[PDB]
Symmetry: C3
Subunit: 229 residues, 3 copies
């Protein structure tokens, strides 16, 4: 890995403030909302960064960090990420499903594929045998591919049969999640959890940009449109 339990601190601390202020913004905003549908969109979307803040704080305060022996060392693995992402990604996926109006069957498949992507990714992070950490990465990425597939050629189709304001916001969000989401298995692979090419200092800066984007950025695009009505 890339030994780091203090230099990344600034990024952990900044991600804490951003997620923290991101929650605050969505909070002091859905406040007016009377429409039960928009009400659901603000609920899901506000909860995403709210969970992100607590876990980002845990990593900053040191709780979210653990040490796992693999290779020929003891590696600094921030597990709070998996704790965050486990509820955050299925919540993000529900916004997309509600927006486009997906079947209860597909929403269950997606949440299921997602829980598996995060749990499997968690087992990979905590696995002591260097070689095996890549098997789980393979299985985790495979599930993401399954998820990004229906989001693309599946939700897109169900979108075009909705009001244009809705068809387009989804278009924008769809692109943002498919692009952002696929960066995690890459950062993970080259980062301190896989082939230690990139230092934890950097891995943490990357995850931060992606997180704030995948949640607050995403939330902004959504919450600031009439598609949620």
């Amino acid at each position: 890995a890339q030994i780091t339990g203090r230099p990344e601190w600034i990024w952990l601390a900044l991600g804490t403030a951003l997620m923290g202020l991101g929650t605050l913004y969505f909070l002091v905003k859905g406040m007016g909302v009377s429409d039960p549908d928009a009400k659901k969109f603000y609920a899901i979307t506000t909860l995403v960064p709210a969970i992100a803040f607590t876990m980002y704080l845990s990593m900053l305060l040191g709780y979210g960090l653990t040490m796992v022996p693999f290779g020929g060392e003891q590696n600094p693995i921030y597990w709070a990420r998996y704790a965050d992402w486990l509820f955050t990604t299925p919540l993000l996926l529900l916004d997309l499903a509600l927006l486009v109006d997906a079947d209860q069957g597909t929403i269950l498949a997606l949440v299921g594929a997602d829980g598996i992507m995060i749990g499997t990714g968690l087992v990979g992070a905590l696995t002591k045998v260097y070689s095996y950490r890549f098997v789980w990465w393979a299985i985790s990425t495979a599930a993401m591919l399954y998820i990004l597939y229906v989001l693309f050629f599946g939700f897109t189709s169900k979108a075009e049969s909705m009001r244009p304001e809705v068809a387009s916001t989804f278009k924008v969000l769809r692109n943002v999640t498919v692009v952002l989401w696929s960066a995690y298995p890459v950062v993970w692979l080259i980062g301190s959890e896989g082939a230690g090419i990139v230092p934890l200092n950097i891995e943490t800066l990357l995850f931060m940009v992606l997180d704030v984007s995948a949640k607050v950025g995403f939330g902004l695009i959504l919450l600031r449109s009439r598609a949620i009505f």
Copy 2:
């Protein structure tokens, strides 16, 4: 903290019997119920103490206790509480939401705010740095405040547009949960998990009275009325 892994035993054992008999009572009672709505109320309400019993038993049998180093010692932290409360409090919140007929958006916000209250409280209990245990307590209590706010000025409003039998049972329950619930962060703060003013022996007696009340007491008020129909 307040070193204790045997004197509180009587309270752990009594809370076990009470939760145990509380489940039994609700069990041999919803037995007749044919109304699918009352059927849901008995389901949720019976599951609350049923979960409470197992966790109370774990603490009595010693499993639910762990030791966390903070201050200048090794402190006896009963973590089973957080394991219990994590499912129990959202279940309790669903009874109130069903009774008053809340929006899927607000129920999601509440369960979300609640999961955060318990998890955050759990991180606070397990945190080794004395100072930080209070940050999480602050964040956990803040979420409770958010929860007790909608239960009060939110559910109350939605209650008044229901049959009077319903409007009033909620009134009673609302008061019981807002009053009881806000005692936990106080007991926690002065107890062995925070400023060790109160001994674990006592902290455990308090949590017991509050638990049995917040669940069996609460359940009795609810299940023994026609509001569940």
Copy 3:
């Protein structure tokens, strides 16, 4: 217990392939399905073995094994089972509930009774005091009995008021789960997690036959009928 962290490997590895190919089969099959109801059945049913594969792999790769001191030794406890079963059994129970069209109250009772059966079984597996491991087993089995009761004299009744194709597939599935499910507490009791009569080598072969049957076998009976429409 029955010391084993390598001879059972072949069964762990075989259960991995079977669950793996079982998922694959259901995958390249619900592919056509346009009916949102059948769509839900394929979702739930495919997710069951998909989760089973990951956990079976964890046990094979060594991650799902831990050592618990009880009796006068350090016993090899495969905890991944409880991780698997926690989502898998409630999912299996939802197929039965959807098929027969159960009330939201009873589905909640069942999932609740089930979470308790697995968690309680998990506490029993991890408990260091030999004597106590049987208390949890008693509580876990009691919950299973509650579950198998409604599946039998409860769902059966609700089945007979459905299309005959549906009434019968449920009949078959009902029998398969009640029979298979009740074998787990027996295997557990005589296996390495309880009265070490049976060696881990064998306990693992038994759990494997039961798992593949309870999921892939079950799934086949269901997915290969028109009852899911």
